[PDB]
């Protein structure tokens, strides 16, 4: 505790350090404003239940009533009502991926599959995505009255953006959540969460810190450095629960992150984390709907150490490259032939402006058609007399039979979508 004994003009608004009078106070136990010691106050401890089973009591575990190890809500990953079900039955927390649901009729049908199957009393979260303002147009008015019906949806994690303060007030005050997750990617995104917690001092906020070494849509900043500049003023908000993720898969890996002994690599005080979320670890599990040949590919993809994940922008690093999405922000994906072909069109065609776009596709045409048929998952539609072609040189019957080829799964006698059946 720093006591500036020269100057007497207390109080600083953040109360980092004291002034002249704190030497002088004659109250017995009220004179000593203590400094926060991070290694003693919020260290992970153990606790037994009444049934004798042992938990790790952290600040994240105490709010949820279970182990400090949640499964992060992913679009493709967290979409199988079954991966969110029987991992809650294991006793672990999961937020439902809202991104793969497209109407409030379909999600309410999906939530009822969980609540009918998980134990009476368990709860799930809903991971929405803030850069889909269509999904917040129906999903947020869904959560307001579905919680008023009383369903066990207990939290709302907002990925891909931190809301403004007048919006995050409405996400806390009106609709009755237990806690609220936020996933910052920058220091200005972290300091915007601290702006939310000081507006609502008693409501829990689970700050989910993910670095750029995760999967899914990446981030530019390092994992360690932004929180190492911000851990001091996150912990001055006692409601913010800090959770670190982005690349955690084993007990020997992330025990230095819970205990806090990782920052003595960086000549800093021990900096314990309250909880740990899992991303790409849960995909090869039995109760996920990742394809069996796709799970074998992830097993074949050896990982990369943390010291060299920045070279993912150039080369396949362990079989995983980042690549540019529709609107520019990067996306970590595995390095198959189609995803390497995704990058070839990003460096060459997709970065061009509009005036050179139609001319570059004309000169690159039969080469693009070559690997849409061979390498990429969305084929080229034109196929006349077993020759690849343009669309306007196909008959109507072979237009229709190619729509049955590319939209109907003959092995399982079902359509990809009803709305593609309503297209054919």
């Amino acid at each position: 505790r720093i006591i500036l004994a020269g100057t007497l003009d207390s109080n600083p608004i953040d109360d980092e350090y004291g002034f002249k009078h704190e030497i002088f106070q004659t109250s017995a136990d009220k004179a000593i404003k203590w400094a926060p010691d991070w290694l003693k106050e919020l260290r992970p401890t153990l606790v037994k239940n009444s049934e004798g089973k042992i938990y790790v009591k952290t600040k994240f575990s105490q709010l949820l009533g279970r182990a400090p190890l949640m499964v992060a809500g992913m679009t493709p990953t967290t979409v199988n009502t079954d991966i969110v079900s029987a991992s809650l039955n294991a006793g672990y927390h999961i937020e439902l991926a809202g991104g793969g649901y497209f109407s409030p009729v379909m999600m309410t049908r999906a939530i009822d599959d969980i609540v009918s199957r998980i134990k009476p009393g368990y709860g799930l979260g809903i991971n929405l995505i803030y850069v889909n303002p269509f999904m917040l147009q129906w999903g947020i008015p869904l959560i307001k009255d579905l919680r008023e019906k009383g369903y066990p949806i207990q939290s709302l994690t907002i990925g891909a953006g931190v809301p403004s303060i007048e919006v995050a007030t409405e996400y806390i005050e009106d609709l009755g959540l237990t806690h609220l997750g936020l996933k910052p990617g920058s220091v200005d995104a972290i300091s915007q969460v601290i702006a939310i917690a000081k507006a609502h001092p008693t409501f829990p906020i689970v700050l989910q810190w993910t670095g750029g070494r995760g999967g899914g849509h990446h981030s530019f900043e390092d994992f360690h450095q932004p929180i190492i500049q911000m851990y001091s003023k996150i912990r001055r908000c006692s409601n913010i629960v800090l959770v670190a993720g982005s690349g955690f898969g084993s007990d020997e890996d992330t025990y230095p992150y819970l205990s806090g002994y990782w920052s003595e690599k960086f000549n800093y005080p021990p900096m314990p984390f309250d909880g740990v979320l899992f991303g790409s670890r849960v995909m090869t599990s039995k109760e996920s709907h990742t394809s069996l040949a796709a799970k074998k590919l992830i097993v074949e993809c050896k990982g990369v150490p943390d010291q060299q994940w920045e070279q993912t922008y150039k080369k396949p690093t362990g079989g995983i490259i980042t690549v540019r999405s529709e609107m520019g922000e990067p996306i970590h994906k595995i390095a198959t032939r189609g995803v390497m072909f995704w990058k070839e069109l990003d460096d060459t065609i997709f970065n061009l402006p509009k005036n050179k776009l139609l001319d570059a596709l004309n000169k690159k045409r039969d080469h693009i058609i070559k690997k849409l048929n061979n390498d990429f998952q969305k084929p080229w539609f034109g196929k006349n007399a077993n020759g690849v072609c343009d669309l306007q040189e196909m008959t109507y019957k072979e237009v229709a039979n190619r729509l049955v080829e590319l939209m109907y799964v003959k092995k399982s006698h079902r359509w990809i979508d009803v709305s593609l059946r309503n297209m054919y």
Partner: protein, 255 residues
Amino acid sequence: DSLWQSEDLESVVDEDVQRTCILHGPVASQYTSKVDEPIGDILNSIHEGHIARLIKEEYAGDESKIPVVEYFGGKKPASVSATSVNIIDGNQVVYEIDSELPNKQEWLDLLAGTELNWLQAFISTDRIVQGSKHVSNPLHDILTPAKHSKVTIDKKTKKLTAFENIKGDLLPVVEIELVKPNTIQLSLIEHRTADTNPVALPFLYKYNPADGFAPILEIMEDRNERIKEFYWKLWFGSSVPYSNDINVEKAILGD
């Protein structure tokens, strides 16, 4: 939309995984080695890895040194700069109250007590499970502080009984006690009837020590028939027995 194929590679050109995009992380792949292990056994095997290290490092290899609680959760780790002197636990307690001491939110903490038990759970849980729901706590507003009231907690929180003043006299209106094992009965008492005999509304709450996020789940079985027998005693009296076999089509005679 290149995304959903991961769990549905069968319905794609030639089921070749390459043709597809799978979202995954660079450092996370070196931990994913064995396939189709269950999602519980992934997270269990790394939780017990953290337990076995934290037994060995900070607890000297002894499991008995670990603190033991009845339930885990519910009490807020966010401690504000508040006076912990007014947190009072007791053995055989009466708590009279007037206009000033205390306010609402610390009055629930006085009736909790520092030790974790069912009454500390039931006075202070945010939620009561009503058949896989999470609806608001009934005691959290019916035990709101009021003038001339008092509550009575006796012999290590085994029964809470709340009083309030009516017509000068002071009679029980709320009773919480344990009944037949590991079940709370919230007995909510109504006094003013036809012949001034007090009648009480039997509620049944089940207590679950294993779950701490929602420890107390309300028994929704036979609930509507408990509430109807209470109103049958009110509107009619105890002189008529409870008969629920009323035929709906026939007209109902009076007197």
